Design a protein around this ligand. Structure first.
Ligand SMILES: *[C@@H]1O[C@H](CO)[C@@H](O)[C@H](O)[C@H]1NC(C)=O
Ligand SMILES: *[C@@H]1O[C@H](CO)[C@@H](O)[C@H](O)[C@H]1NC(C)=O
Lengths: 438, 51, 438
């Protein structure tokens, strides 16, 4: 038998349901979402990190002429200078009054420590979500883990269950993301091939160890103005360091709904938004004929005390009369109130206490004991403690907070003044008829 | 939310009271619209209803 | 100096433009799009290929009892059978009257040749476009290759050139694509985890050589029914073969705009659609002061003959009077027509021809010779041939097909009945006054 449900997508909130078929006793069905897993599809754009300016020994063509030559290294900057006059600890390195010339070149490469300090930029799209479900039926437990998409099944422990697409999609990740040292940041990194000095992505490379690098960081040489030999370079501060200083808070402290974001798959887990439509197929063998199921008679409610508490704190008692020893299910088909246990033993005339939770003060509902029904109502009071972190609002409020007394007051206040004006018009026409009679 | 219901209740009751007052005043005027001086009171019950 | 243009994204159609600066003679600027390049972002969903059923030897128990056991092999199926009595060329392999029992199991693995026949299912998104530009200015040629995004200037001679964004995005690829043996097909493959017998992707694996495989193909065993030993298996026809039979035409024969689709990068090339806005920065040194530019006097057009052909077939001639020898640029600012050469030698009183093309029968426009302008008009006739495969419509039609004679007929077409009604009203008022005087 196939039976469908809509279950809140929130961990640690069991959902109870039944399955009605003629000739078979009802079977309890418990659904639990053990943990969520939202994994998106991503492509690596590039990787950046703190850089290191290489300053190779300046070439000196002395008492001669020399010309600049370009190269392929990233950020390569070249410049010649005439009239230079190198000096060194040994003394004048050549002999000519300013006829010499020296060529100076500089370029950049990622520092060795980058091998562990790299920050890689990612583009993400088409978030996908995977759910682990644990189902319980007929005091038997089954596992499954399926993608919420409905075309994919999950077959496990005699059962194959198909999920349905989320009602409302959540995706904390933005189009652009940055990941570094296990921390994820939401940041619009520059597109590959776009370098701007003094900002993130000043050095870019397809891979960490890619011999080809593209980057410009505004390196300008300066004419030597000292006795000895020295190439003075000047450049803007590293962009990666500047981004590190004011990167802002990470995405852990900003993702809505408390999504625990792990890095190596770059995926969120254990966070709730939306509902899962889920259809369960159950083998007919697991079901039990009503003939062997216990038969109950004269079932009655009694609400000893109920508290309108966030935690499950309402209490109830049921008294039955039966003839066959056995086990029977129990449920509260009213969505406002949720019971605690599903199946209970049944005796000839025994009574059993039940625990439950509710989200409304006017706790009224129909409870199914075994195969039979029973209506019952009571009033609950608010609790002393008003802050607690355990599963709350097992059912969302449905404007049922209005108590019968408030409804009575609102209804009583209103009066039939429309009927009064109608009577006024009626007596007006009656007076016209009276004038006719006069 | 709670403020809205009270304001709506007040508006509804005020409208109803005004409509009832206007209707009863008009009914009294229609009953009193004839001068009725040539004959005596048509019926003392009508007078009692009027006042 | 920075100068902007809008160019048609189409190979082999040069675009001519000028740059106007006071005191500098106009500089020609030719832009050519050598080859388009559209590469989308992709991820590997899974791979599939013709499979092979493994039929391992059945486990026979002589004069005993046995039970099935599940396994992790993909599509693993098991079944036991009592009453077996296997025989061989030697004779009976067991001796007890039906006590023995035979267990038969089956699973499927990709065929060896799969290593070359594999078909990969891919998901694609966020199409990105790369342009190769060749720019000629002042008889100096330069090259560049830039992403279409207008935020990633390309590098060529340490020059920044920005292109795009495209006016209208275009991508022949759909959300889901498949690729096999160098051919791309547009198909809606089942998502990972969903297997349907007799359809594409019945065997799915994360990688070609992945030990973990998930797949079902409706394998059902049959009870032994022959004297000897055998494990009869029945299975649905391979899905991949059926998809191959009726896969339909590839994307090479359906992509709009004639895009050449290469497989390894999985990207399209050399195909035209939309417009590209491009900003070009030219070094000031390239410009030449008008002081040294030749000076021209008394320029005059003459259209010997014009043919309204798709190719470049229109002819023109210019007569000039100048004083200084040199080279002067020539251009046609009217988009309806485009010239052939950008510069020409200028003599004291020489006259020179020019080859141009137009997209209207009425070829009138303003041609700039060096710094001076010259209006001139002519009428062109349609060509004898009407089918050719050479660059055509260098400028799109601008409802200019209307000829001057057609405009004259339109002017003679309209009639002024409004004047007649106005005269009627005037005589009405005058005759009303007269009738009053009657
Ligand atoms: C589950 O409940 C049925 C109902 O009586 C019972 O027969 C069965 O033994 C129970 N299973 C277990 C494992 O307790
Ligand atoms: C380019 O044109 C200018 C202008 O006439 C000329 O002086 C120069 O020599 C030309 N360069 C080449 C390489 O032809």
């Amino acid at each position: 038998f196939e039976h469908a449900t809509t279950v809140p997508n929130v961990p640690g909130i069991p959902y109870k349901a039944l399955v009605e078929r003629a000739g078979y006793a009802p079977l309890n069905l418990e659904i639990t979402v053990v943990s969520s897993e939202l994994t998106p599809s991503t492509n690596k754009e590039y990787v950046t990190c703190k850089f290191h300016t290489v300053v190779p020994s300046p070439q000196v063509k002395c008492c001669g002429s020399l010309e600049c030559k370009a190269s392929s290294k990233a950020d390569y900057t070249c410049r010649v200078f005439g009239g230079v006059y190198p000096f060194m600890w040994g003394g004048a390195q050549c002999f000519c009054d300013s006829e010499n010339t020296q060529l100076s070149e500089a370029y950049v490469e990622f520092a060795p420590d980058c091998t562990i300090d790299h920050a890689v930029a990612l583009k993400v799209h088409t978030a996908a979500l995977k759910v682990g479900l644990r189902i319980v039926y007929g005091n038997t437990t089954a596992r499954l883990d399926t993608f919420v998409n409905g075309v994919t099944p999950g077959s496990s422990r005699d059962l194959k269950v198909i999920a349905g697409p989320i009602s409302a999609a959540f995706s904390p990740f933005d189009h652009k993301v940055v990941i570094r040292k296990g921390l994820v940041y939401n940041y619009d990194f520059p597109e590959y091939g776009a370098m701007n000095p003094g900002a993130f992505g000043d050095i870019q490379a397809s891979s960490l160890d890619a011999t080809d690098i593209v980057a410009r960081t505004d390196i300008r040489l300066l004419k030597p103005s000292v006795k000895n030999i020295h190439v003075p370079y000047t450049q803007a501060v590293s962009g990666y360091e500047m981004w590190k200083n004011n990167s802002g808070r990470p995405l852990q402290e900003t993702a809505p709904f408390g999504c625990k974001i792990e890095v190596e798959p770059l995926r969120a887990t254990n966070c709730a938004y939306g509902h899962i439509p889920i259809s369960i197929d159950i083998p007919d063998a697991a079901f039990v004929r009503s003939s062997e199921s216990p038969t109950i008679l004269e079932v009655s409610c009694t609400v000893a005390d109920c508290i309108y508490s966030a935690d499950f704190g309402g209490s109830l008692t049921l008294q039955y009369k039966a003839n066959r020893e056995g086990h029977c299910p129990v449920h509260s088909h009213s969505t406002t109130a949720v019971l605690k246990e599903a199946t209970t033993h049944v005796t000839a005339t025994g009574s059993i206490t039940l625990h439950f939770s509710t989200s409304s003060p006017q706790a009224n509902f129909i409870v199914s004991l075994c195969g039979k029904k029973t209506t019952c109502n009571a009033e609950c009071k608010p609790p002393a403690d008003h802050i607690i972190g355990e599963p709350h609002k097992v059912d969302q409020e449905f404007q049922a907070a209005v108590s019968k007394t408030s409804w009575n007051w609102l209804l009583a206040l209103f009066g039939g003044a429309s009927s009064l004006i109608v009577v006024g018009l009626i007596v007006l026409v009656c007076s016209s008829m009276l004038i006719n009679t006069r | 939310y709670t403020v809205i219901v009270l304001c709506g209740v007040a508006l509804a009751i005020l409208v109803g009271t005004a409509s009832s007052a206007a209707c009863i005043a008009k009914a009294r005027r229609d009953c009193l619209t004839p001068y009725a001086l040539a004959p005596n009171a048509t019926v003392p019950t009508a007078l009692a209803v009027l006042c």
